[PDB]
Design a protein around this ligand. Structure first.
Ligand SMILES: Nc1ncnc2c1ncn2[C@@H]1O[C@H](COP(=O)(O)OP(=O)(O)OP(=O)(O)O)[C@@H](O)[C@H]1O
Ligand SMILES: Nc1ncnc2c1ncn2[C@@H]1O[C@H](COP(=O)(O)OP(=O)(O)OP(=O)(O)O)[C@@H](O)[C@H]1O
Ligand SMILES: Nc1ncnc2c1ncn2[C@@H]1O[C@H](COP(=O)(O)OP(=O)(O)OP(=O)(O)O)[C@@H](O)[C@H]1O
Ligand SMILES: [Mg+2]
Ligand SMILES: [Mg+2]
Lengths: 247, 232, 70, 413, 233, 253, 403, 87
């Protein structure tokens, strides 16, 4: 019926997609995800929004999802919307492997998903995917990489970025204190912790509200790890001492 | 299957959704293409390098085929989709006609694609205007512009997106056979036009060049800087 | 508009309660079920200060109330 | 780290800078400022207490004769009479706003000369009756007649022949030739309300009628129909129609009747209360248990949709007339009419400008004919040209002051 | 709200009325039918000097004996032209003949107004085509001129002008046209009227002219020919 | 706030007590100052300060005070206000919370407020219109800087826009000291820890921690507030509602 | 009479050099010299010429006959040569006798008539009853600005000059073709882009009787007083010689009409209707030209903006590139800039920078200078002003959506 | 209550406010009522006099049914113009 229709895919009097920019407003409130590209690896750090004395610890992560043997991504938005896209990404990657018998390049995998996101913004009468993703991976064409996407179905490669709550503050700090072409993995972790510290105004980093994963190439095989509590706490102690030394 | 009439006439004889999409094309970046005697040049003014963004993945000039390339101005995602459909069609024509596509032909296909998206049911007009350049089999340089309205035309040169009209006026008064006498003059001609819109210059405009036989070539930042200095 | 009027009333209340007048002498008591849905300006100190919980009666409370009412 | 400014700091700052003759400059400026005040104070606003006829034309009488006028000839006070007791010399009068009273008739005036309802000259002290006063003719009500002939003929009202014929069928013929309406016995429609987009000649045709009305053309200054004290407006309209029913073939024009008329309601402050009351009085006068007579009403508005229904229905206003945008021929004729006094080159094709000015109105056609020779005056020529007129059209209408559709926008070919 | 298929209090479709209105915005086009043949002219209305005037094609060929002139949403005209050509070739393939002008127009018109929203097709047309086609050709009956409005209405006409100048272009056609007019007389009269309605001075670059005759096929005048006619006109 | 105090003094004190300096520099005297701020972190205290230290002629106007039901009476009042100011030589007006006669113009009709809009227009014109007001300066304070109109915030009417930030830790220590220098603090009352115990405070909640502490003291009919007293006070003052029903919190994740 | 009462100003023929210099000293000294000469002469000639046989005994007689506290009353239907009816402020219809001093002409119905307090008698006419709320809108101290003070608005200034100055400067230019000079220009544009500046400029070289309005002061609280203050305003305008009335901020009484439900939003509509009627209705309008300024031209009811009532809609836009440098030159002159603070750089960058922004940057720049204890502005003193004046502004599209 | 003239009230009013004209007998007042709906009473007096007005305008002697119909279209301000499409 015309009366109950919502008209989600129609042009605003000034040339704007309302449901699109709005869907970006929803993404401003999500957990803080921070990705940094290093000379030796890539890393994703995510603010663990959920923390309670009764939530149990399940899965190897709550926002970091593995896609291939040499890829991973983090989400920021609606898990129901995010879970749909994560499932589609795995299908796309495996479909490419079946066809070509070679792991899907990171750029192509991102393009495939971004193609899906554009479709939802154009036709169908369905609400846009209000989810933004940071992809990290390695491939024989461009080595380590880091990508970002928005509900607008648009994407771009970065050397370091963040999305979610207090993204603007992080990118500003990252823009100021990122050393292009001379950042090792350890420095990337240290920079991430510093960016995370300021980004969570509420309280401070307790080594539980943060989950970190690092992608590195070892013996010719990509390795994806999620840093445990011990090292996350160890990094935190290292940063605190550095802050005290500065002051 | 959502099948509602998205675009529908309005009193005084107009199509809103087509107009609105046109403004969306305006707010984009400024892109300029000129047709030389034996060279066709495209340029674009970059909103922001951002000092972190990898410039590789933000290319706004692409090759539909070895002898066809285009530049756009508008919604990026709508631009990436349109390019894919053009690329597959170019191969399909190569498969059947056994000859390279013509700039005029591919422009008609892309234009025909957009025209099908305004009139269709449950769809949104494409928010991009595309500038298609390429050398036909005869070798005559070609330049085509397509608006979201689906209308396409052949030009000596023109500009889309933010800062279009002013640039075109600059092109109209400053375009001449003498300016198109040499390849360098054509390239400098483009840069001055963008500089008419973009501020920084040299570091804020990406330039590309297509020759008769050679494939697309993207000018290095050093080459762009050298040309900018020559103009100054 | 015409919904800005509730805003105007709230702003005038805030101004009178703590503005460039410092009445001092006069106290103010307000009652509203549920306090999570309130303006932080009217909830901060220098304004309605002490939040008093008026819970549903406990077992002891019921006895005392029943005595005093019967 | 912004340390404040100390008194010594200010003192030094005021004196380290180029002021060879600057203290003197400021002093002299202050002296000039204080001198202007003296000059105007001593030449202040005088010679403004006018109101004195030159006691030279009547200089001779402008003397003790005036005092003779004073003293005797007691100043009376106006007042009406609500009864005159027959065979009983007592009368009852209502002065105006003070109170009622019972009055005796002065010997100087015979009772027969004084009737019921006439205005008497009651005196102060003891309210006795003296020289009666003629019926009032209010100043506001009497300051409405056209009493002139505006310089607009029917010919200049171009671009609409059907509209002019429709108006003429009710405003001119039904009074200047009753014969045609008797042979068929067709009741001449009375009440013509003119609609139209903002600016189309709705007032031009009204003015044109005034040049051949050969009768009264009272022009209702709606703003005057509303006054502070209640009932003022109703009385104003009643006096309007009462003077209407005093001559032959009176036409009353209510320009922009939207001001006085509107949908009734009791929600916001009970509506306008007083304004709605004036509207109701007007409606009752136009139609009711009191046949009006030989008075016709023309009213114009920009939006008829905001008129009270009890006034849009026939009876009060019968011949509604759309005043739509001119047609091609209408535009050509309008250009010709508002170009006949212009120093324009003979080779100008006005049939083309008409096409190039679609959906425009008469006011726009003017603003194009003008502002057309304005570019010529800018170029310092004396005979404008077709290029000038075309540029004027492109700079006035169609594109007017805002043309967004331009950058690579050529989809209509 | 206000579905495409809706009726006004007069019994008038809203969309069809609007679409006809949009036609006025388009450029002028003049088509005159004569016993010697049918002639078409048009105003190109060059937006800017940079644009190549060759790529603004306002007069196309449907077959060797059929030509069309357009005005309105030129983007909308494209699909209408494609259907006409296919229908002409399909008729030749099956019946080994040449479709008459009326038959082609009837086929094209049958495409106009075949639009809907619900239970029509996966991708059917939603809105009416806003373009007015002047079909001209030579058939077994001789020269033929048919005008088509957006309402799907086609009616053979002796002389007609469509476009922004239609009102007045028709008026001029009225004062000059007559039955025994020759092709050259039609071409000149067409050029004058197009010149009068055209704001910009008429030259050889801004107007497309074509003619169909019993002997020759559809012919689009070249710049050399166009200059010759405007030289005398 | 000390930089903010100096900034406001440069616009309400310097150009009125030392006129000749501005002319000597050949610049136009400033007029106007707007103060942002989180819920409560100042304003209405710098306002009283400037009223109590400057012998100009302060003139108050609340938010919902220039709004009058009878049409036009909401503009005659503003015109009379400025006429009185001009009649009273150096003067400063501290329009308190000014979202009331402010916000952004709404499309008219019977779908929004209009008379308040006319009052805003009258104030705008009188602040910068055909006549150049001399020796009159306006101070406007109102939360939600982003809701005001594009006119009242045009550089030239509200020249410099002071930004009041929620107190830092170092400033919070100062606030605690200043609002505690009448209470008999014990020995060992380490104000440093008590200040660092308040993150992202409001600078008015400091005088909840320094007043409900004394309110605790009253219960034991004693004096000499203690450190445990202050800690309990902070825990009793800075208790935001938070959230429940993690489903909604688990909706973005 | 239609007195062309000027602004009664220009007592400052304007000192040519603005840089403190002995040329300035000498010129201002000449100004003072003539002013003192005038004062001296007027006082001396007042004292001299012993016409002390003044008072024209006869005028003393007239004043004697017209007693003390004369009263102001409205004349009414005039009955006889030597008799007429008057209506006092209480609206009581006395019947007075017109004494001889009153010119039988000039006494029309509705004309305020003076009276004797004791015996009501028309003693004299009063031709100055302008509403004391309307006479306060006549500019009598011409604002000090010149078209040269404003900059970068050539095309947008020539348009106003061709309808506020030239039509009375060389009116032959217009009649020679017969086009009636354009009347009424609406200056619409974004906030802080001129508007009022051009209004004051046209006020300066007036040569006419400028009337200033506010756009809200017209609205009145007594039903009808609204649509009579405007009537009085334009009556005064037409009575006085050629005039230009600037109805500033016409966005107030201009809202698009609607079928309302309140009372105030109907009285305001009636006010707009009075404005429309008089500006272009059954009547005429002499050499009265109306200038209207607004921030939003889209809200004005189509009617008050029509090409017969308000022609030549000027489109004051945000300043362009060259205009920016021009305005900086005009607003930075009277400052001792250093040798490395050339303004050719502060332009550009932000695409949003209005004239008000420019003056703020120029003023909070000198104020910044008076912080390192210096009177010569510096490039740092300018680069520290863009971060303190231009702030709080809104932003635009998210990068990535487009380039 | 004075409800709107349904259709027979409309016919009767059309007849009543007439009979002072040279009306021809050939006028289907029932069809006129069918055409004119929501016409509140005196809206006839309007229409059933505008009929005679138009008859005089044309130049004639007798009222005609199409004359009444044109009057009906007129009294609503509507205008009838032969449209360029019927298909
Ligand atoms: N059809 C026309 N032919 C000639 N002149 C016309 C025509 N239409 C309008 N005009 C001119 O338009 C000018 C302006 O008209 P004006 O605004 O006074 O009246 P109006 O069109 O009835 O509008 P309003 O709604 O303001 O009363 C008139 O002087 C008149 O000469
Ligand atoms: N730096 C400070 N030092 C001491 N007291 C402070 C400080 N800042 C704010 N206050 C306190 O803030 C209180 C007044 O609140 P505030 O100044 O925020 O009012 P307001 O600006 O009107 O606020 P709102 O925005 O809620 O209307 C006073 O009790 C004052 O002591
Ligand atoms: N182009 C300019 N050249 C010179 N001064 C300018 C320019 N633009 C703005 N100004 C200055 O800006 C100051 C602000 O007042 P201005 O008259 O410009 O405002 P406005 O445009 O009338 O504003 P409003 O929108 O509030 O009516 C004025 O003193 C004026 O001199
Ligand atoms: Mg009118
Ligand atoms: Mg003014």
């Amino acid at each position: 019926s015309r009366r109950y229709d919502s008209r989600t895919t129609i042009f605003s009097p000034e040339g704007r997609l309302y449901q699109v920019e709005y869907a970006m407003e929803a993404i401003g409130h999500a957990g803080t995800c921070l990705g940094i590209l290093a000379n030796d690896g890539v890393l994703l750090a995510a603010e663990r929004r959920n923390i309670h004395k009764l939530l149990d610890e399940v899965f190897f992560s709550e926002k970091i999802y593995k896609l291939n043997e040499d890829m991973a991504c983090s989400v920021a938005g609606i898990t129901s919307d995010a879970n749909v896209l994560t499932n589609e990404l795995r299908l796309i990657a495996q479909r490419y492997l079946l066809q070509y018998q070679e792991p899907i390049p990171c750029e192509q995998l991102v393009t495939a998903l971004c193609d899906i996101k554009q479709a939802y913004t154009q036709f169908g009468g369905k609400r846009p995917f209000g989810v933004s993703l940071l992809y990290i991976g390695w491939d024989k064409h461009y080595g380590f990489q880091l990508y970002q996407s928005d509900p607008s179905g648009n994407y771009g490669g970065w050397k370091a970025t963040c999305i979610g709550n207090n993204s603007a503050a992080a990118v500003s700090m990252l823009k100021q204190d990122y050393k292009e072409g001379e950042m090792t993995l350890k420095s990337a972790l240290a920079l991430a912790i510093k960016v995370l510290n300021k980004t969570m105004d509420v309280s401070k980093l307790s080594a539980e509200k943060v989950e970190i994963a690092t992608l590195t190439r070892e013996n010719g095989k990509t390795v994806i790890r999620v840093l445990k509590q011990k090292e996350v706490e160890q990094l935190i102690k290292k940063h605190e001492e550095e802050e005290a030394k500065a002051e | 299957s959502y099948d509602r009439a998205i675009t529908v006439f309005s009193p005084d004889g107009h199509l809103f959704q087509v107009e609105y999409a046109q403004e969306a094309v305006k707010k984009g970046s400024t892109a300029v293409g000129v047709r030389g005697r034996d060279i066709v040049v495209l340029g674009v003014e970059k909103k922001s390098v951002a000092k972190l963004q990898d410039e590789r993945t933000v290319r706004k000039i692409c090759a539909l085929d070895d002898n066809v390339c285009m530049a756009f101005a508008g919604l990026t995602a709508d631009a990436r989709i349109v390019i894919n459909r053009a690329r597959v069609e170019c191969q399909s024509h190569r498969l059947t006609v056994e000859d390279p596509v013509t700039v005029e032909y591919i422009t008609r296909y892309i234009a025909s694609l957009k025209q099908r998206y305004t009139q269709s049911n449950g769809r949104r007009p494409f928010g991009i205007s595309a500038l298609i350049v390429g050398f036909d089999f005869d070798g005559t340089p070609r330049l085509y512009q397509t608006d979201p309205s689906g209308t396409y035309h052949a030009w000596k040169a023109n500009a889309i997106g933010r800062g279009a009209k002013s640039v075109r006026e600059f092109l109209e008064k400053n375009y001449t056979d003498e300016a198109i006498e040499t390849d360098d003059l054509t390239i400098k001609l483009v840069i001055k036009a963008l500089l008419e819109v973009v501020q920084s210059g040299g570091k804020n405009i990406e330039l590309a060049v297509m020759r008769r036989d050679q494939s697309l070539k993207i000018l290095n930042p050093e080459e762009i800087e050298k040309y900018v200095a020559e103009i100054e | 508009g015409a919904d800005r009027e509730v805003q105007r009333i709230l702003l005038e209340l805030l101004n009178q309660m703590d503005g460039f007048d410092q009445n001092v002498n006069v106290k103010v008591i307000m009652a509203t079920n549920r306090a999570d849905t309130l303006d932080p300006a009217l909830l901060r100190p220098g304004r309605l200060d002490r939040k008093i919980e008026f819970p549903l009666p406990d077992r002891r409370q019921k006895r005392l109330i029943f005595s005093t009412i019967t | 780290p912004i340390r404040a400014l100390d008194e010594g700091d200010i003192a030094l700052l005021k004196t380290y800078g180029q002021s060879t003759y600057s203290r003197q400059i400021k002093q002299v400026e202050d002296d000039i400022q204080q001198l202007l005040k003296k000059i105007n104070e001593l030449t202040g606003i005088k010679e403004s207490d006018t109101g004195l006829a030159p006691p030279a034309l009547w200089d001779l009488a402008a003397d003790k004769q005036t005092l003779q006028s004073e003293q005797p000839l007691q100043v009376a006070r106006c007042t009406k009479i609500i009864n005159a007791d027959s065979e009983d010399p007592k009368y009852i009068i209502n002065v105006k706003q003070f109170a009622k009273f019972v009055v005796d008739l002065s010997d100087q005036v015979a009772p027969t000369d004084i009737e019921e309802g006439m205005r008497v000259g009651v005196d102060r002290n003891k309210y006795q009756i003296h020289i009666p006063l003629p019926p009032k003719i209010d100043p506001t009500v009497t300051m409405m007649q056209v009493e002139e002939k505006p310089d607009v003929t029917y010919s200049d009202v171009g671009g609409c022949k059907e509209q002019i014929e429709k108006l003429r069928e009710v405003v001119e013929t039904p009074l200047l030739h009753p014969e045609r309406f008797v042979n068929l016995g067709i009741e001449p429609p009375k009440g013509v309300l003119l609609f139209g987009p903002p600016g189309t000649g709705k007032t031009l045709c009204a003015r044109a009628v005034a040049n051949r009305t050969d009768a009264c053309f009272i022009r209702v200054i709606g703003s005057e129909l509303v006054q502070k004290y209640v009932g003022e407006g109703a009385r104003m309209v009643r006096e309007l129609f009462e003077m209407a029913r005093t001559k032959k073939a009176c036409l009353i024009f209510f320009d922009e009747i939207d001001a006085i008329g509107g949908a009734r309601f009791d929600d916001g402050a009970g509506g306008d209360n007083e304004v709605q009351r004036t509207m109701l009085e007007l409606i009752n006068q136009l139609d009711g248990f009191d046949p009006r007579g030989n008075i016709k009403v023309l009213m114009a508005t920009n939006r008829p949709d905001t008129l009270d229904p009890a006034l849009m229905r026939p009876g009060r206003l019968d011949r509604k007339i759309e005043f739509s945008l001119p047609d091609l021929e209408g535009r050509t004729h309008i250009f010709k009419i508002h170009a006949r006094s212009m120093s324009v080159e003979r080779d100008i094709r006005f049939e083309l400008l008409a096409r190039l000015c679609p959906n425009s109105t008469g006011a726009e056609i003017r603003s194009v004919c003008t502002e057309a020779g304005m570019f010529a005056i800018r170029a310092r020529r004396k005979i404008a040209t077709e290029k000038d007129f075309l540029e004027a059209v492109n700079k006035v209408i169609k594109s007017y002051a805002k043309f967004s559709a331009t950058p690579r926008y050529m989809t209509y070919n | 709200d206000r579905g495409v298929n809706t009726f006004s209090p007069e019994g008038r479709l809203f969309q069809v009325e609007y679409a006809i209105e949009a036609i006025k915005l388009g450029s002028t086009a003049i088509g005159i039918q004569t016993s010697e043949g049918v002639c078409l002219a048009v105003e190109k209305r060059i937006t800017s000097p940079l644009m190549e005037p060759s790529s603004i094609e306002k007069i196309v060929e449907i077959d060797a004996h059929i030509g069309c002139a357009m005005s309105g949403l030129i983007a909308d005209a494209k699909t209408l032209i494609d259907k006409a050509r296919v229908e002409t070739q399909n008729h030749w393939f099956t019946y080994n003949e040449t479709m008459t002008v009326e038959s082609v127009t009837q086929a094209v018109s049958n495409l106009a107004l075949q639009f809907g929203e619900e239970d029509a097709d996966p991708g059917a047309m939603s809105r009416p085509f806003g373009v007015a086609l002047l079909f001209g050709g030579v058939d077994e009956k001789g020269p033929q001129l048919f005008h088509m409005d957006p309402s799907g209405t086609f009616v053979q006409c002796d002389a007609r002008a469509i476009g922004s100048a239609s009102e007045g272009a028709q008026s001029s056609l009225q004062e000059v046209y007559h039955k025994s007019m020759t092709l050259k007389e039609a071409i000149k009269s067409s050029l004058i009227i197009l010149k009068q309605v055209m704001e910009e001075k008429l030259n050889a670059t801004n107007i497309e002219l074509a003619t169909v005759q019993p002997g020759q096929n559809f012919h689009m005048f070249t710049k050399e020919e166009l200059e010759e006619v405007i030289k005398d006109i | 706030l000390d930089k903010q105090i100096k900034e406001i003094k440069e616009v309400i004190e310097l150009p009125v007590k030392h006129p000749e300096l501005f002319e000597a520099l050949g610049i136009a005297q400033p007029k106007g100052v707007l103060l942002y701020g989180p819920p409560g972190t100042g304003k209405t205290l710098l306002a009283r300060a400037v009223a109590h230290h400057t012998d100009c002629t302060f003139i108050r106007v609340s938010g919902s005070e220039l709004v009058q039901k009878f049409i036009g009476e909401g503009a005659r009042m503003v015109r009379e206000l400025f006429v009185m100011a001009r009649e009273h030589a150096p003067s400063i007006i501290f329009m308190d919370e000014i979202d009331s006669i402010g916000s952004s113009r709404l499309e008219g009709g019977s779908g929004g407020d209009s008379e308040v809009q006319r009052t805003m227009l009258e104030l705008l014109n009188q602040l910068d219109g055909f006549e150049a007001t001399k020796n009159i300066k306006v101070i406007m304070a109102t939360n939600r800087i982003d809701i005001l109109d594009s006119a009242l915030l045009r550089p030239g009417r509200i020249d410099r826009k002071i930004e009041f930030p929620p107190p830092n830790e170092e400033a919070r220590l100062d606030i605690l000291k200043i609002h505690s220098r009448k209470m008999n603090l014990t020995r060992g009352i380490n104000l440093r820890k008590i200040a660092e115990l308040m993150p992202g405070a409001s600078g008015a909640e400091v005088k909840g921690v320094c007043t409900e502490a004394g309110m605790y003291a009253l219960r034991e009919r004693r004096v000499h507030v203690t450190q445990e007293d202050f800690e309990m006070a902070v825990a009793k003052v800075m208790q935001k509602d938070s959230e429940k029903n993690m489903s909604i919190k688990k909706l973005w994740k | 009479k239609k007195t062309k009462g000027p602004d009664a100003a220009s007592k400052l023929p304007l000192v040519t050099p603005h840089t403190q210099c002995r040329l300035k000293l000498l010129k201002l000294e000449r100004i003072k010299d003539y002013l003192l000469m005038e004062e001296e002469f007027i006082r001396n000639q007042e004292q001299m010429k012993p016409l002390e046989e003044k008072q024209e005994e006869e005028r003393s007689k007239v004043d004697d006959l017209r007693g003390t506290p004369m009263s102001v009353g409205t004349l009414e239907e005039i009955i006889d040569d030597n008799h007429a009816i008057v209506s006092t402020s209480v609206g009581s219809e006395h019947y007075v006798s017109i004494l001889s001093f009153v010119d039988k002409d000039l006494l029309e119905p509705g004309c305020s008539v003076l009276l004797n307090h004791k015996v009501h008698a028309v003693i004299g006419v009063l031709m100055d009853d302008t509403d004391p709320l309307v006479t306060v809108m006549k500019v009598e101290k011409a604002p000090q600005e010149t078209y040269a003070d404003i900059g970068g608005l050539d095309n947008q200034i020539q348009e106003i000059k061709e309808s506020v100055e030239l039509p009375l400067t060389h009116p032959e230019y217009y009649e020679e073709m017969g086009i009636k000079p354009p009347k009424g220009v609406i200056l619409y544009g974004p906030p802080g882009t001129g508007k009022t500046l051009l209004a004051k400029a046209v006020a300066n070289q007036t040569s006419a009787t400028f009337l200033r309005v506010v756009g809200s002061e017209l609205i009145q609280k007594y039903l009808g007083d609204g649509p009579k203050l405007v009537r009085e305003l334009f009556r005064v305008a037409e009575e006085h010689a050629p005039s230009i009335v600037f109805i500033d901020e016409i966005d107030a009484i201009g809202t698009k009409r609607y079928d309302s439900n309140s009372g105030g939003e109907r009285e305001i509509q009636r006010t707009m209707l009075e404005l429309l009627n008089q500006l272009d209705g059954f009547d005429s309008r002499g050499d009265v030209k109306v200038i209207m300024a607004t921030n939003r031209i889209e809200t004005l009811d189509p009617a008050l903006i029509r090409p017969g009532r308000i022609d030549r809609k000027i489109e004051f836009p945000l300043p362009d590139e060259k205009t920016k440098k021009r305005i900086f030159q005009i607003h930075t002159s009277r400052m001792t800039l250093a040798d490395d603070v050339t303004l050719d750089d502060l332009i550009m960058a932000k695409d949003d920078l209005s004239g008000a922004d420019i003056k703020a940057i120029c003023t909070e720049a000198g104020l910044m200078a008076l912080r390192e204890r210096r009177m010569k502005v510096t490039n740092e003193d300018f680069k520290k002003s863009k971060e303190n004046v231009l702030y709080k502004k809104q932003e635009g599209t998210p990068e990535g959506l487009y380039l | 209550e004075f409800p709107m003239p349904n259709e027979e009230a409309r016919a009767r009013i059309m007849q009543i406010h007439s009979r002072k004209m040279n009306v021809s007998p050939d006028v289907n007042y029932e069809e006129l009522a069918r055409c004119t709906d929501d016409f509140n009473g005196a809206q006839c007096k309007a229409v059933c006099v505008e009929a005679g007005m138009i008859a005089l305008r044309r130049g004639a002697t007798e009222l005609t049914h199409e004359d009444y119909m044109e009057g009906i279209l007129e009294v609503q301000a509507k205008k009838k113009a032969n449209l360029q499409y019927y298909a």
